[PDB]
Amino acid sequence: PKHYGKTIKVYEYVPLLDDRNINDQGIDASGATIVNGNLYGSSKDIGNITSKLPLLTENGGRVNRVGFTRIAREGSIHKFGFFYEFTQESIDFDSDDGLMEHLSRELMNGATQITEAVLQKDLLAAAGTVLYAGAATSDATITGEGSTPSVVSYKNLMRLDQILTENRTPTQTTIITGSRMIDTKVIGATRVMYVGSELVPELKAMKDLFGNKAFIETQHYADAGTIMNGEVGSIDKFRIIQVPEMLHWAGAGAQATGANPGYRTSMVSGQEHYDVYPMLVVGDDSFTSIGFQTDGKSLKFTVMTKMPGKETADRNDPYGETGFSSIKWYYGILVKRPERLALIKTVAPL
Amino acid sequence: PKHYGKTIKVYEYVPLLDDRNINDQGIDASGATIVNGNLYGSSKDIGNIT
Amino acid sequence: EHLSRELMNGATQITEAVLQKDLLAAAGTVLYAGAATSDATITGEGSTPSVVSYKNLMRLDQILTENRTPTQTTIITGSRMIDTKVIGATRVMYVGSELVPELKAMKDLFGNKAFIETQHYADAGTIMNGEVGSIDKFRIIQVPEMLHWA
Amino acid sequence: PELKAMKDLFGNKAFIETQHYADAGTIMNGEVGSIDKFRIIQVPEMLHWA
Amino acid sequence: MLNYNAPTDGQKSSIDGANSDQMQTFFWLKKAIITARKEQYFMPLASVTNM
Question: In the sheet where C116-117 sits, what is the strand order?
Answer without folding.
Answer: C91-95, C138-142, C131-135, C116-117
